[model samples]
Target: VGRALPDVRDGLKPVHRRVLYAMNVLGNDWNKAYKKSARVVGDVIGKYHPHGDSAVYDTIVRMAQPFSLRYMLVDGQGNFGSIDGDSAAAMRYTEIRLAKIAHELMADLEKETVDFVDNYDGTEKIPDVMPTKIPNLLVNGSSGIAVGMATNIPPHNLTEVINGCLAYIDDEDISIEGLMEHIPGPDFPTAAIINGRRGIEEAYRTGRGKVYIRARAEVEVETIIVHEIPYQVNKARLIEKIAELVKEKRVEGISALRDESDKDGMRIVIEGEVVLNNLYSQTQLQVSFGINMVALHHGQPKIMNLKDIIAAFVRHRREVVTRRTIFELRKARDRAHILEALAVALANIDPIIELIRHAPTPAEAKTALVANPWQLGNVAAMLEDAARPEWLEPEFGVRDGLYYLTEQQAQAILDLRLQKLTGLEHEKLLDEYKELLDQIAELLRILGSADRLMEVIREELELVREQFGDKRRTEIT
Candidate 1:
């Protein structure tokens, strides 16, 4: 089901999800560097979505094509298709990097918010869902059909979708009518006219609707010139069909149907209406897109409406933050645990030095350290601070004023304390330890309350919108 609907959690079909991840694997980040498409696709086929190169290659092409996606995930350099339905320049010639917005998708992969399962042969591990910050499904409407199902949601404006999300967060009970206030309708990349809200309303409500669209044909100088056409409609083909109709005499008005695009029109008058309306039937002037919001909900095929997807994404973002904070908290406590042992060793440095001198072997030195209890000393003050993860069955469990060293802590000191361990400056150690204390304190609060995490989610959502938002190019008339 490589061509199937997106996973509602992230709005990515398997192909897109894997492509961006594999692209990232090759250092193809938005700013870092651009790798040739073939190597990027080369890595992709050898791994996830491992069917063929073309599937991954087309994904790269479509992603780079601004006319194909509302917000591009891959910043492609070179010919990445055209609105006239031109094929992209071959992968060998084009370069790609993760578009800036793509960073929002793979933000916390290192923190392990999403689990990784081994690749086809257990040769490598790939992400499961690959969580995202910006809700990609709505932002960059995906177009694909599974066996017996189709998912063709229109791409939306980044600002509109974010505002709609904020609205949902404010009120789960918010009506679709209210959502319309923030997100009026689909903002097609071709910037055509969506005739009315009949389709938008039906799809947002029922997961099925008919989107009526038409070219932005203006009647000027008694001639009809089209500025924009419907989404995914081939301009070359539209012109061809109109010329074919004139040859067959199916319609008559003006004898000319021509293109004015260097990268990015034609003439008529009122039964200019008769000609345009008749041409609409035979050409791509007007097309009704069937909105079928079928997607994988928890890996099961389900027809989801706007609210269902928005709610599911909210759930995903919440889980992502919780997992990331947990991951960060574990690291903080681990460093603090190591610092506790080091602080103890530094306070009683004279005794440990003599102990090491007396011991003939490294193994003996380690055994002696673990074998004896040291004064909890100044670290007790550090440990006593609220930052200590009291629930984490203490690493250096101090019984009364004495500290018992775990073998791992003993080994850590042996490995790091002796030689090239950052000068072992006492103040520097305490300073870092105190800084970690402050950090852990905040991470705990982030995990402790949903409100705190939601604040982060809201802040990021707004920041992203503020940066990337733009006026709606497509009009709803």
Candidate 2:
């Protein structure tokens, strides 16, 4: 049950997730040079998958195939595979790095967006699920059979799915029909035509149905040219099947069958006295793909309809964004802490320098800096505009005309270098301290309000759409 089922959160089986994570660890980011497939395969087997090399290589091939994934995950350099059913080159020859969109999947990973568990031998930790905002389940789809249950979901257009997600966020009470307006139906990577809408409607409503997929073919004069076929159909095998049918005379009136395909486009020509409808009916020109939208939702198997799937994705994103915000807030506060100490040291530069020079040892200097109450100077004015107001009074107490430093502030004063006593360095320290405080305020606001959080989500989604969105390929009748 666990092996084949993809998690609804990331739309990845365990193996697929491991491969991407391993690549990330190896520094195979979108901007980096491609690494050898053999290197990635070795790491996946030795550390994460503990499986055969062929299986891992096959997963990598599918992720890179443009005709396979609506949005390809791996950017492969040598021969990976082809839509014509050709095997990829040896792993040693192929090189790959993560696609830009893939980076989004692991975006807030370091920010504690998702849980991590130890690997097989407990030497390392791996993410339980990716912290992705791409709506991967719908965008890339999944297919697997496990024990008594199975799943077969079709890929979708990136822009459409995001629009649907944004619409759902705006109005939680929106119906499936309303969501459908934004996301019409499945958008396959293979540009084929859906015969009717009944099957799509049934599957979206009930999670199980069969949809007819026909080759994108057209007739011109005495020949019929075929372009695209159904998803997962082997192009070479399809041509071979047509040739076999003509040789046996089961389907009559074809003078010649030839594959006139090249890099320009896919063109299969059938020249003779062939009736288009009859030929299509008798060959691989048309096929039916069943929709069984089953997946692992919260570690349990369930068949989910359209709304259920979208809602699950949205819930996961909200949690990831919230956790990521909290993580950043903590880091910002910590930095702001250090900057506060630096600002106080800069304000009393003369006294601090004199105290350090007069002291016999480093320990004595630190003690004197902490014990004495120096003048506040212009530092008190700077604290008024700071974001974390709590930091001003407790850490650096002020009375009538003097200021007392805490242990942390005192250490910072002792650590100061002669170069930082310059006028330029003093200005830089004050500028950075004020900026950090401003950042702390913005982060707090995001964590404090649900509306602001959702707005952030929307802005990020729009940015992704602008960067990676493309035209739809598959047509829904």
Candidate 3:
């Protein structure tokens, strides 16, 4: 926010700036002689960004690591590790450097546009923002969780993002359609293009969109072979889905399934009974399901982009802070004095024990309990209130039976909440809401490799018209 600095509207976090600068200071070339990562880490820690040295070095090493990035900006020479989620050598042992592309893109970052700011310790100044021509956001999409709001933007194509950037620059109030002119959709590092244009539009406009993707493959002779699967969908699952379709007669004529999935990437060959049926079978397979578009639900946990995660965290933190501040502010009031006293009573082991020990009945003991912040903060334990078990415990209700709500039911809870809803069945409604929220939170935690939320999308939109089609009524006629 200083004068004479490039005002980066989309700000870079301290970590990002430090990592980029560290690479820039280390000669801005990928092939340069490797410096000890500790040196780079120290430079970042000392000069500009102030924070954990390990975290900064981690960012640097990851940018350089090939397996971590599709096109690495750092040209680390020794023991950078493979792309199989393996860890590289320690910073001291590993040689440090930058990629040629990174150097080219990062040239002149310390120039006129960016403003230098005080380091974390307030010792020195560093660039407030880095000015580079390349859209690093597309090159590297970042994820962070704060309090309330989160930013879940995926890394987009540099070419597409730049185009959108240029378009956005030219027109202050451009429609999303105009922005789409440049960036058609997410440009995955793997280089496969997203097929559906609608998905791209929806995602960009709403800041979230569901796109269906397929592996790029061609039919060879009598077989429809695949060399890749869409991003995130497991290779085995792809084959399994196809097999399920074939078994159900939704797809026919698939004679055999081949699992060529290996370190070389996913290679699946669908050998058909008839040579002519290969093209039809493959095309039908793609057209039948394509990729299911899933909507991100509020408060529903899922694997989201860093931006979205950070935004959500920020919002949540704000809520907690506001709530706590309000509770503190009201603790001194006359009506709330009892609440304050209760909190103090609950805080001490002796008071809590005494209250429980003297109480004639369980109901009387419960009545002696405190419910204010001070008491809770002072003695978080010793209160008769039962401790909630860690979520790691198998949810007894779910494990004991099929008590889990489908994704549809989860979405229904969110969508069905009303304002003027005075009801005699309030207790039952509250219990149902609590049950659904707990399950939804569980779903968020163990989403695993399954695109479970897509089921909700499929179910919800089943009743709605597709962009290409007429209204499809879901109700029985």
Candidate 4:
């Protein structure tokens, strides 16, 4: 790290720097023809970044993702899936290298003044890190989790960043107010105008605050107007909030609200509820989730990105899944420890099956099973034991003496908690664990194949990094 490191890691680290370097080595103009993504990833790993191939590749994919990168740094042709959460094309099927902007920034890595570190495997020429003249950190925010710190930065418009740079150069004493003159606020790539610029300023000022964004709107079929909620706001909530506002008279401008949200793509109609007795209240019903006013206005629903949606959903269901996973895992671990406690209980087929078939409540069944261990054991041997599952017996027995569920080994599966865990956050963690388990079980399933998963991930990673271009050169008007 440099002594001049920003209070935050606003600057780019070596992996990002190397990706840029590889892009530069290939070509500078984004419009220029390029080389394969594998070549870029390979060079980066072989020379400048000896870390895991996946790490470097991941950086590449993020740089390429239009949703992740404000202005795509790399122009790629292949599986850059749609916003509906689709996967990109395979790496072998994709072709990419570097954009023009990358060359301008990372052409000769030897000149940058920054530290370097040995690769994790200790086999390559990774730079301590590259230092850029422009505050590329602010230009393209860098994020990662290290020992004790993490960074989460929003992308900004090229025009605003340029202006901010000029402002700082104009006067050394220029305050954030002056900085604002150049970079008024974040210019989200989704094209939503920021609401609550003050909130953004607060975040910049204190390293924390919320940002509001709104989507563009279009009037559909005269009386029916449809608005696209900004990328960051919850699509479902935006409709609900507008409905709530109308019901409470907080939104005195509408007459009636209708739920057309279930239609193909975000559509809601505000109609005159009734003949308003000549009062102008009926026009109040003409509402939309996203419009310039909402985008520019604070406290209304804002635009959001696919990532934002994913994160929001994760946050909302976080506790639910975590609890479910913990409970289920504990149950499985306990059963594993009991050596046939489960089977023994199930072997008491008649009693166990009868209890399960007639048990009124789960609590009562639990009681009976504990009370009559020998009976439960007989049930287990006859119908519940993994070794000898009995037919015709209700697989589960009652606790207090009535039945609840079937008793066979499959019953063990019923008590498990189920959850959905797929997305950027859980993918990497699961991949590692999945790999270890696969090796242990000698599984051949693709889900368990770490080597194959790494291959898929490496390609996407290369694509993302290569997609990342240099800061946009748009000047503020």
C-alpha lDDT score of every prediction, in listed order? 0.80, 0.84, 0.46, 0.44
By summed lDDT, the worst window of 10 consecutive residues in model 2 runs over 383-392
* lDDT tens per residue, model 3, 1-477: 121111122223556566767668667455556677777778877776557777776777767753345446667757655433346678777767766556534444543334566765776666654544344544445444344334334445444444454444345467777666655565444424355677656665555655655456667757777654444344455567677867776665568888765666656787734532443345332331122111132523233322332233233223333333333233212222222223333234465556566979755555444221123443232222111223223331122212222222222322333431334333344344334444434444333323343333233222221221122111110
What root-mean-square deviation over C-alphas does model 2 reach?
3.2
Give lDDT tens digits, candidate 2, residues 1-477. 777788888999888899999988998988988899999999999999987999999999899999889999999998887878889999999999999999998888899889998899999899999999888988999998777768999898889988988888899888888888978789989858888688888888888879988899888878888988888888888889888888897776677888988988898888743456778788888888898999889899888988888888889989999999877777776555566667777776777778888999988888898787776668877654334334456545555556666776677777778898889988888888677777778878888899999899998888888898899888888
TM-score of 1: 0.91
Provide the TM-score for each candidate, comma-separated. Answer: 0.91, 0.89, 0.45, 0.45
Clashing pairs in 2: none
Ranked by lDDT, the better of candidates 3 and 4 is 3
Model 1, CA-based lDDT: 0.80
lDDT of each residue in 317-392, candidate 4, tens digit only: 2222333333334443333323234433334445555776676876566655544435343333222212112232
Over all chains combined, what TM-score does candidate 2 have? 0.89
RMSD of 4: 26.4
Candidate order by lDDT, decreasing, is: 2, 1, 3, 4
- Stretches of candidate 1 exceeding 4 Å from the true structure: 1-3, 264-274, 346-362, 376-380, 385-395, 417-428
What's model 4's TM-score? 0.45
